[PDB]
Amino acid sequence: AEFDADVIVDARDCIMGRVASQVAEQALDGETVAVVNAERAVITGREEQIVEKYEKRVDIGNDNGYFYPKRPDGIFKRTIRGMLPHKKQRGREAFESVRVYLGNPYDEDGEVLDGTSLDRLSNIKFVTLGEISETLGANKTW
Amino acid sequence: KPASMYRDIDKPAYTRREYITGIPGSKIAQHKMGRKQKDADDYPVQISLIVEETVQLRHGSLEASRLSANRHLIKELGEEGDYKMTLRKFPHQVLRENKDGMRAAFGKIVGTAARVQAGEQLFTAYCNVEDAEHVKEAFRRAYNKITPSCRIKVERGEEL
Amino acid sequence: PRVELEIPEDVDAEQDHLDITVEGDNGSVTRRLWYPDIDVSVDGDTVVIESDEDNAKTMSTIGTFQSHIENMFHGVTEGWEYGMEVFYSHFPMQVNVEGDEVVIENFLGEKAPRRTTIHGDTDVEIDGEELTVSGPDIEAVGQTAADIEQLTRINDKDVRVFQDGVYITRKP
Amino acid sequence: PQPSRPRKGSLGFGPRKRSTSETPRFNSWPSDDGQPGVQGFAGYKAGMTHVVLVNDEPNSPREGMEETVPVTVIETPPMRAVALRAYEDTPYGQRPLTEVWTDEFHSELDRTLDVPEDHDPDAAEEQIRDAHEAGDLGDLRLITHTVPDAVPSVPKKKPDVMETRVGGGSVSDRLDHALDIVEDGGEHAMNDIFRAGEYADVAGVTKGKGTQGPVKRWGVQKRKGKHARQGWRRRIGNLGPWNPSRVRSTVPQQGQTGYHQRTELNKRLIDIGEGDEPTVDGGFVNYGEVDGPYTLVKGSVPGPDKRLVRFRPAVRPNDQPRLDPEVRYVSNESNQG
RNA sequence: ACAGCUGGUUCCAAUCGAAACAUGUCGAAGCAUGACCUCCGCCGAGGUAGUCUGUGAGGUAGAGCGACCGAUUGGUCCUGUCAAACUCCAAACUUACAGACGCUGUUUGACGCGGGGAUUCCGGUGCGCGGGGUAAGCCUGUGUACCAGGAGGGGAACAACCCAGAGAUAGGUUAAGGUCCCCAAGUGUGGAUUAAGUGUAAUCCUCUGAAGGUGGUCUCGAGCCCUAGACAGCCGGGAGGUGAGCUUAGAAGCAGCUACCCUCUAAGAAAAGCGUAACAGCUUACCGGCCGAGGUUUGAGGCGCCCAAAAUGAUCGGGACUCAAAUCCACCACCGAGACCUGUCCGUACCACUCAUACUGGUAAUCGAGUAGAUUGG
RNA sequence: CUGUCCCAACGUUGGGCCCGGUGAACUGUACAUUCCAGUGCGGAGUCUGGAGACACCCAGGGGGAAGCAAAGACCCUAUGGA
RNA sequence: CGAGUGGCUUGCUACCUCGAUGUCGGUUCCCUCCAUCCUGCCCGUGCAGAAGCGGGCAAGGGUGAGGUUGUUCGCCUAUUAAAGGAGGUCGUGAGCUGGGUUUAGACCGUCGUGAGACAGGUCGGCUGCUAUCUACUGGGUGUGUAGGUGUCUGACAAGA
RNA sequence: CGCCACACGGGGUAAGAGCUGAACGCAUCUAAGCUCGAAACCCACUUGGAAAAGAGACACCGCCGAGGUCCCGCGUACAAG
């Protein structure tokens, strides 16, 4: 429900970490970013291990807790939080001025950032965030 | 006892028997194997087992590797085959063990070891062209019972 | 490298993205041919599998893609046929094709019927103690034929004494 | 070597705190099979009596013989489905769209709700149909209340409002079925949803037992032998090891017991009827007399007398329904004696 | 009461600045005397932390032993190994004295001498070399630098690892280290490798991973065969004398013994492997055909993989990273200390002037960190 | 012989909880909402990294503060004592 | 013979605490590890079958009752699918118990001239504290979200 | 100590059994691809859960009045609340 975004980024076929690193740098530069099509975002490597790293993060916890998101919505949001000093005033403002969305709820198509796109024709060892979330046990709502 | 207690060359050279008493005899039977009457120059093929790291090999390991090497040569070439193998290293370094805590720590004599430098020949077998793959297998079994990684270097083998 | 495959007169093959569709008188086979830097294209009369890389891994798949396309040609013309024989030593095994699945009844004395589902456009025909698995996609036929052999799998007892089951007689 | 033993009590019904709503809320609903219908009803617990039955089970060696079965009597008067709520499929789960209400309201519904005076049942209905056209319509549920006024033994006149799901045929046909019930007056009985012999899931908020200790709450042991006389009788050994330097939430502690929502699975409906056939002599202890629409549910049901219990067709039944069991005798003997 | 034992001992600043060692001690939780720190007076021109050369001292490393000595192989000279308490040899290096250059001293008086006051004699770590010990964040030596008593920068945190020795203030450039985000600076360039999330971990109690194994993959060399058609696969042939002889009831490619010959021919064993009681039956050698381009053998290197099991919640600091944000080879530009350069000021020391230690002017690349402690102004 | 136990239940009396009145002590370097790891004189709420965490209050049983309490009563040492 | 993993035993070392970090065993209650005893799915067999033997994946659940002994350990019995092992300050004394080790009393044996000793045995021999902080179990009051009533959604969380 | 209730099935995997298949004309379960396959995992089911700071949704009532609190009679509730 309405977010006055300055920049709208398209995560489709883009390497998650590389996008997140730029979305962080821009959030700290006062830009209001919005990451779009995060279900279709990419992460490279052997699926089997990538899933194990995320499945462990779900199983980790205690009474204090460790809230790790299962949906590709929150997974991207947490990755961005990882590149920002979110406990500081300047960092919380930056993080809160960044929102991840499933699909594209805007009118405009998002821009693909430089050096973030993965050439599917050149790569076979990767995963879609939606694939990770389906394995984690999340409800497919995209 | 494990070889980890005696494999390194960090201790001084302790060999002088005129000051060391109660040294246990070598478990090694013989250094000259096969047809010890024939010459080493009478063979077209000379293959040596070369030690890659600088270690100390105990008499028990020297014997265990020699036994499982010569036993294969006796199995494949017979008890009187046309070969001759030599174990050129002798167990000169005397080994101790502190077996009272760390007081009067200098241990009692428990055995003997052979200081072999890297690149040195531990074993050297002389054979005929046809028996070459049998001796390469005698050494593959022998290098499995010592401490370092090894090389099977053919010194007189243009026949391949 | 580049391996050019001439398409037979009986066949016509269309391609979009990474998916190749091969149509002929015996049917239609669609497969996905995806591997890094390998391009599979239609030159109207020939199918071209090419890459800029000549390493062992890439070379392995260029050869696999060839034998896949060659197999799709033979599938849409002559077809693929696997032959099987049902053997029993004490209990009369009632093999039947019921719906889209081949059902085996009273195997080794069981009250419960053993059943496996048929993969795609594969046809299983029964003529007594002989079964013939046939179709255009080798992936489908090969597996349906295998599924049948694997349906009479016995782990609990000796295979040498309890030899009952349907077995592959003819491999194409 | 210290013998093994399962932990005291289940961690699945946690946290063991007081229920938010005294009226139970189902979190699961049945699958869409046959003809469209309301997936649940409700009543008010009356008490227990036994019934004699003829064994229905084909696999029982006692098939056809006399058999005594414990049964709980629940007064189930007709409920009113006052509205049709519609949900839409959003990227954030299901969200309510609009609601279709009515004109006919029960005399005392204003004791709970702020009854609608001005509503557009047509524009609401239109939004639902334009959403079905778009392929965004999720499920179809009805807002429903009870008539506690119809039950003389229950003090309350204030209706217990709760939402129930309508499943069945196509989403288009069950939209029609749903609107059709509402447009009238929303009146429906247990005969409309259930048939005697079927397996139902009964939800309820348990008997409130206030604050109780570990022995009652978690079923831990009492201190045994010599330990029992030392000053510690009903307290556990320890609150955990040295490390971790904290008390885990898994260690049995004191607190609230009862007044928890429980959904008891696979409850057989022995009989559905009307009148005074199941009433006990001298009236049901701490309840009253039964004369009207009821339901006889096999065994126990969560909650005390006078409490509202909810019904739903079993989401996971074990046995196949053996409809309309033969009732040879229902006991009317006093519960005092 | 006495105690060699625990605790405490109150204001500011400036100069120098340790010892945790040696000899003796009913001595080892203490002292004394030396080493070493500081202060004063004296003497009066040399001094020697570095280097080179010259004149001397030396037997550790290495090596070797028909060179002594003593261990320690086998054969019918030859052949196989060793040494803290061996030496026919023999360094690097350390060391005496002297000369030379350097540096230093003659108003800052060095070198030295005499006297006053100490503190100190539980040390620790890194590196090199050690001796003991299975090992140790072990014990005990030695040389050295460091912590102790050393800030600041880096290393996630962290006495001794890297940079760096530091008056105040200010501008600038760098060092170690770093440049995808967190986080200042590159999602830098040319080329290659790795697919394991290997790795993104200098050093380490701290960061493991071994013997053994690997048609995972990349690179490099050697030999041999190949359009007179190789390697493989598929087809056809694999035959006669004779079922060799002997053995044996039988043995006929194939139980065993010996031999292992010659015809046909393009090949085809007195048969390499199964198989039969023995035959038969199935391929092997060997020849031909189809086919059509490299194939086969071995050596070496690179990265990875297997080997690989632990207790509350997984980790390179975290995120997360795959033609990299990994690894290796080159290269480009930057970020980054109190270091280095630079403006002013302060303290201290010395010089000129002076009664002045009052001013004024000057010099310091060769002054400015400090626990115990000596000295001095407030 | 029996609630010692299987295996716990219900009850009685006084407390406990709420209200009026009365009214101490122990303890206190400071800061303090923690948790999982790591590091550190090798047994950290405070260091480092992450995670979690809106404030205040009532009741509880005591997991941690190597909890509070007593200059270890073991062991060694003192040119100690009886 | 050779290479290692673990950190349950024992030994070594003497880094931490002697202005005190309560013992062994047991008990109670909680979490965990896998090198798996049972259960699930597998492979081999000297796999006819039945009953086994060996190995693989696998830690969800289970692994119990008793006789001697303070015992841990261990021995023994009958049951059982099986009656696995180990970590948590050898988990757990501001929870219990106090049978053993290890005070002061006493006996026996051995040793000693003797006081008295013993890594010998034996009988008797004490268990403190009103919870400030933190932690968790349950219960409230406020503030934020920015008028109310009723119905819901589901990020995540728990389960054997 | 009594009585009632407490699945099945899907999806993806491990060990494993296979299919198609190349490097390496053959062969090969694996290198790309695919079919199966554990009491284990995910879903299913139960419980909690608008303080989820993106601090949510719907319907209706009300903003001079909707609704709530105190009050009174009581418990399907309860140590205060």
Ligand SMILES: CO[C@H]1C[C@H](O[C@H]2[C@H](C)[C@@H](O[C@@H]3O[C@H](C)C[C@H](N(C)C)[C@H]3OC(C)=O)[C@@H](C)C[C@@]3(CO3)C(=O)[C@H](C)[C@@H](OC(C)=O)[C@@H](C)[C@@H](C)OC(=O)[C@@H]2C)O[C@@H](C)[C@@H]1OC(C)=O
């Ligand atoms: C271990 O046995 C204890 C038993 C008892 O424990 C004490 C009391 C607890 C003791 O505390 C414990 O003492 C041990 C010697 C050491 C132990 N620490 C190692 C932990 C210490 O703490 C413990 C054991 O928890 C006691 C000394 C406490 C204290 C303050 O010093 C003390 O003296 C007070 C005036 C106590 O009186 C006496 C005679 O002890 C009183 C407070 C009473 C009421 O409390 C007690 O008596 C408790 C029963 O008496 C001690 C002297 C024993 O010590 C030994 C070695 O046997």
Ligand SMILES: [Cl-]
């Ligand atoms: Cl958690």
Ligand SMILES: [Cl-]
């Ligand atoms: Cl932060």
Ligand SMILES: [Cl-]
């Ligand atoms: Cl790839």
Ligand SMILES: [Cl-]
């Ligand atoms: Cl108890």
Ligand SMILES: [Cl-]
């Ligand atoms: Cl300095």
Ligand SMILES: [Cl-]
């Ligand atoms: Cl990873």
Ligand SMILES: [Cl-]
């Ligand atoms: Cl002054």
Ligand SMILES: [K+]
């Ligand atoms: K202590």
Ligand SMILES: [Mg+2]
């Ligand atoms: Mg069997």
Ligand SMILES: [Mg+2]
């Ligand atoms: Mg009664």
Ligand SMILES: [Mg+2]
């Ligand atoms: Mg009665």
Ligand SMILES: [Mg+2]
């Ligand atoms: Mg001063």
Ligand SMILES: [Mg+2]
């Ligand atoms: Mg001054």
Ligand SMILES: [Mg+2]
């Ligand atoms: Mg030497």
Ligand SMILES: [Mg+2]
């Ligand atoms: Mg000091």
